[PDB]
């Protein structure tokens, strides 16, 4: 009668793998001065190994799982090589004459210990990944046998007292038919993977590993929450039928699913990822993005040491369009020239880059840039739903000149026997107070708007997004920016178009009810913000938010508008 | 029976002064190479004199007339020392082997000749002042006797074929009872002075100087347009009575006057000067300013090599308040930090000064600055009508924090037995799209607004006022900026306050009908623009302008809005 917390429902049959380790012994014996130089070298020599061995694990994650898991190792490796650790680890040994395994443990444990003080389950899990890096470092200095979970040649079930984030990367998902551990619970990194991977697994067994030996045959019910050890065929049978039900359940659920970001009372909005690079599509899918709301094409340009030609752009766009499957990508034409220069362009310096020769102002002074790019986007639209959107729009003049441009580039494509989506929709960033002001006029001329509040805030308040000295004045949650937001949304709706938002406000927990109440159609953010905002959306009543929004829009003061938001959150969920 | 054009009506009795000169002879004899080095030295040696002699005339103008006439000489002297003249004068002598008096004449004549090609009477007169500088230079190289009009010990009438701007400066106004010349007409610089000086004078005599000898006694009717030469007492009498009528005319007119900038149909606005320094009050009075609409106090701060203390500021403000007589000055608190740094502050660099730590953002981070200044303004208000206005306002928060500040500084003054105008009105620059957006809210909190369109344009369009590369996008005459202007004016009026404008649009001939139609209460500009705009205002019908304004505000395009303005100007005056 053994029961755990069951993190993923399902059924499985296979052999049991047991991870046996040698308790990490730490010597608290003080070292002499002559041993100070030797201990540092041992740390560097031991650190020298993990450096190369950690790199080997990274390459396996990229080929095995992809770039989504490959970069996590770079962060762990980059954090390990942090110059702060080198000076802090060496200082304690040199200053306190402590051992490298005891001194190094304090440094990584010290930071992770600070993270645990946090009162958040999400921050605590990351502290688990950081703790794992130091835990293996001690083995690396001592030189402990590395079982390595990658050396699995046969399908088996994975059983362990607890797994550290480092093992999950170099873990064979195809050869592991499930995961069973006695860790704490869902707050365990590996436990979250079972949920997302959708594979049967337990994490609160409590003491199954002490009852299982390697090569043991076990059947996981993950339905009755029971484990059969060397059971006859009468149980191997029941289970097999339990597994049938499980499979039928999928088959039935497989029909319809649910509705996207929808308030309690039925109001739907889109919620999408802003991206920079195909590589960001992974995070977007991971975080439940319903499409891409802003594809900052600059970022692709800073992903290279030369200006990407029509063809390179096309390919890059095609990949994205395809890595997005059915989903729509809003490809913004290039926005170089505020805090985002590309050095390879060698553009001249400006007194105020953010009020300078930025984005569209360049592509219009150098048509080859605008042309290659729009050409490339159009052509890529033959391969997935793309939209075109323009940055730094300031006038109706600009929009007409660029549409006219599109139309020219469209014909050329037609003439060169090159498909493009003839349906392709065109919109504009509203991220200038100009644009916001003439929103009505612009709304006749485009299919949609996305409000860039980073910029809009910047120009409306004349506060440089980069300038920490006045950051306290950078308030996208001003009665001034909100009003301009409303005015834009309304413009959209008056023409029967829609406004999205890719500025950081979309992703800001504190604006979500207002953005919603004000009728924003689409939110686009860092992928990581998608769930927080989705959550807020799913738990609001839309009508209430309207009332909230309206109130907020009448406040002459941020504080006063923050108050409304807060009393709402108090009274309303 | 001699008749001229009569530039100023009046009567006068006195001796006649005759300016006799020796025709300037120019040698067209080519010089040899050995003479090239000698001719340059002669030019430098001759130029060396005029350098010191011109400086002497400047000092007489400052003490005699004031700073208004002292700076005109600096421009003439600064232009003469222009490095372009040194290279061009020397190049022709060295390259064409020409004489210094013949080569130098071509350089000054060449530029003045280009100015005459202009089709404007105002630009042509300035070409007369530049021509005068080169005319005297030829005498300075030759070394011609200088009668000097400053050597007058007895009251006399001034008679000459024509006077060059240079003579008008070193001219004794108190010892000259009038001016008579046979020049071309009002297009003559000296002719304008008779109008502004309000003294009897003729400029189209045609040939009076050839009929008058120095020391001749002449009576100027300037009423019957006749001159009596050595006439009996019967005419010296009639005239004396004519002069009586003239004096009574003044006495009667001396009652009331007229109305300020008023459209044909009775709509009045204020029209004022923006200033930097007491010294600008002169230009303001000169150009018919009805008060000062913006006293950029920064400029006073850049008039010094140290931060001006409370006391220095007070004095500076007091002077202005007093140099303005009955007139109101709108003293703006200090606006340092976009393109206007004061080097002595050694502030650190910013990535976007114009979106940085500017104006009020400083005075609020360093109260001593705000305090000294507001203290000084208040105290100066005990001495003339002053208003306080704040730059770079972005929120209602900012305004309340600063009013609260005023109130504290007010009490301190009360407690130190220091008068200040308890009536003192407080307003804000609306030059941020934030301010423009929350204009309604701000209007409850201040007594007035002045729209800074230089900045407002800048932030609304995100185009740096400094950046020539994108200057073509800097359009204060956008449907976006105009709308925001309207919205501000309306805010004012809704609270029963008023909006003025000190941005350059106020002074822009092309906005005047719109600004007017949109109900702007007050215009403030460079003094030099006051008459052009006054003229436009005085010749419009206000109702028509409203209609114009309204139309313009609906245009989605600048061009389209320029068209309205133009068809107006065509059809309406």
Curated annotation (Swiss-Prot), chains A, B:
| Post-translational modification as stated in the protein's UniProt record | Phosphorylated on Tyr-122. Phosphorylation on Tyr-122 is important for polar localization but not for interaction with TmaR and for activity.
Instruction: Provide one Gene Ontology cellular component.
Output: cytosol
For this protein, the Enzyme Commission number is 2.7.3.9
Q: Which GO terms describe its molecular function?
A: identical protein binding; kinase activity; metal ion binding; phosphoenolpyruvate-protein phosphotransferase activity
Q: Which cofactor does it need?
A: Mg(2+)
Q: What InterPro entries does its record include? A: PEP-util_enz_mobile_dom, PEP-utilizing_PTS_enzyme, PEP_util_AS, PEP_util_C, PEP_util_CS, Phosphohistidine_dom_sf, PTS_EI, PTS_EI-like
Residues binding phosphoenolpyruvate are 296, 332, 454-455, 465
Q: List residues modified as Phosphotyrosine.
A: 122
Q: Name the GO terms of the biological process aspect.
A: N-acetylglucosamine transport; phosphoenolpyruvate-dependent sugar phosphotransferase system
Binding of Mg(2+), residues: 431, 455
Q: Which reaction does it catalyse?
A: L-histidyl-[protein] + phosphoenolpyruvate = N(pros)-phospho-L-histidyl-[protein] + pyruvate
Q: Where mainly located?
A: cytoplasm
List the Pfam families hit by this protein, alphabetically. PEP-utilisers_N, PEP-utilizers, PEP-utilizers_C
Give the record's family classification: Belongs to the PEP-utilizing enzyme family.
Q: Which PANTHER family match?
A: PHOSPHOENOLPYRUVATE-PROTEIN PHOSPHOTRANSFERASE (PTHR46244:SF6)
Record function comment: General (non sugar-specific) component of the phosphoenolpyruvate-dependent sugar phosphotransferase system (sugar PTS). This major carbohydrate active-transport system catalyzes the phosphorylation of incoming sugar substrates concomitantly with their translocation across the cell membrane. Enzyme I transfers the phosphoryl group from phosphoenolpyruvate (PEP) to the phosphoryl carrier protein (HPr). Can also use (Z)-3-fluoro-PEP (ZFPEP), (Z)-3-methyl-PEP (ZMePEP), (Z)-3-chloro-PEP (ZClPEP) and (E)-3-chloro-PEP (EClPEP) as alternative phosphoryl donors.
| Other observations noted | The reaction takes place in three steps, mediated by a phosphocarrier histidine residue located on the surface of the central domain. The two first partial reactions are catalyzed at an active site located on the N-terminal domain, and the third partial reaction is catalyzed at an active site located on the C-terminal domain. For catalytic turnover, the central domain swivels from the concave surface of the N-terminal domain to that of the C-terminal domain.
Q: Give the protein's recorded name.
A: Phosphoenolpyruvate-protein phosphotransferase
Q: Which organism is it from?
A: Escherichia coli (strain K12)
């Amino acid at each position: 009668m053994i029961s755990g917390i069951l993190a993923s429902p399902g059924i499985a049959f296979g052999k049991a793998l047991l991870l046996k380790e040698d308790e990490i012994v730490i010597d608290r014996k003080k070292i002499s001065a002559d041993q100070v130089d030797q201990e540092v070298e041992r740390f560097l020599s031991g650190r020298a190994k993990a450096s190369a061995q950690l790199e080997t694990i990274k390459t396996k994650a990229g080929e095995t799982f992809g770039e989504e898991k490959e970069a996590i190792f770079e962060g762990h490796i980059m954090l390990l090589e942090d110059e702060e650790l080198e000076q802090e680890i060496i200082a304690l040994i040199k200053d306190k004459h402590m051992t490298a395994d005891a001194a190094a443990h304090e440094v990584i444990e010290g930071q992770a210990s600070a993270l645990e003080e946090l009162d958040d389950e999400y921050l605590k899990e990351r502290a688990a990944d950081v703790r794992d890096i130091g835990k293996r470092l001690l083995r690396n200095i001592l030189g402990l046998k590395i079982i390595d979970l990658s050396a699995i040649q046969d399908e088996v079930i994975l059983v362990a007292a607890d797994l550290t984030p480092s093992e999950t990367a170099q873990l064979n998902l195809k050869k592991v038919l499930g995961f069973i551990t006695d860790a704490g619970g869902r707050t365990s990194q590996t436990s979250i993977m079972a949920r997302s991977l959708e594979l049967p697994a337990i994490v609160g067994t409590g003491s199954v590993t002490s009852q299982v030996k390697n090569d043991d045959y076990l059947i996981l019910d993950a339905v009755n929450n029971q484990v059969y050890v060397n059971p006859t065929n009468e149980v191997i049978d029941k289970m097999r039928a339990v597994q049938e039900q499980v499979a039928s359940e999928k088959a039935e659920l497989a029909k319809l699913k649910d509705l996207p970001a929808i308030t309690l009372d039925g109001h739907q909005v889109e919620v999408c990822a802003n991206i920079g690079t195909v590589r960001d599509v992974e995070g977007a899918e991971r975080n439940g993005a319903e499409g891409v709301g802003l594809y900052r094409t600059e970022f692709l340009f800073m992903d290279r040491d030369a200006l990407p030609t029509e063809e390179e752009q096309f390919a890059a766009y095609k990949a994205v369009a395809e890595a997005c499957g059915s989903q729509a990508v809003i490809v913004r034409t290039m926005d170089i020239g505020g805090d985002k220069e590309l050095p390879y362009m060698n553009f001249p310096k400006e007194e105020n880059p953010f009020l300078g020769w930025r984005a569209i102002r360049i592509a219009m002074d150098r048509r080859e840039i605008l042309r290659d790019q729009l050409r490339a986007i159009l052509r890529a639209s033959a391969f997935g739903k793309l939209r075109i959107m323009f940055p730094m729009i300031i006038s109706v003049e600009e929009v007409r000149a660029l549409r006219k441009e599109i139309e020219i580039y469209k014909q050329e494509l037609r003439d060169e026997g090159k498909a493009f989506d003839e349906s392709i929709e065109i919109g504009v960033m509203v991220e200038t107070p100009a644009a916001a002001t003439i929103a009505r006029h612009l709304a006749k001329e485009v299919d949609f708007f996305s409000i860039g509040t980073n910029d809009l805030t910047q120009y409306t308040l004349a506060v440089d997004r980069g300038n920490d000295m006045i950051s306290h004045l950078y308030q996208p949650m001003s009665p001034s920016v909100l009003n301009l937001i409303k005015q834009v949304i309304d413009a959209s709706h008056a023409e029967g178009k829609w406004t999205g938002m890719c500025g950081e406000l979309a992703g800001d927990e504190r604006a979500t009810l207002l953005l919603l109440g004000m009728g924003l159609d689409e939110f686009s953010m860092s992928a990581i913000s998608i769930p927080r905002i989705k959550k807020i959306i799913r738990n609001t009543n839309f009508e209430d938010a309207k009332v909230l929004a309206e109130q907020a829009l009448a406040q002459p003061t941020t504080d006063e508008l923050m108050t409304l938001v807060n009393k709402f959150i108090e009274e309303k969920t």
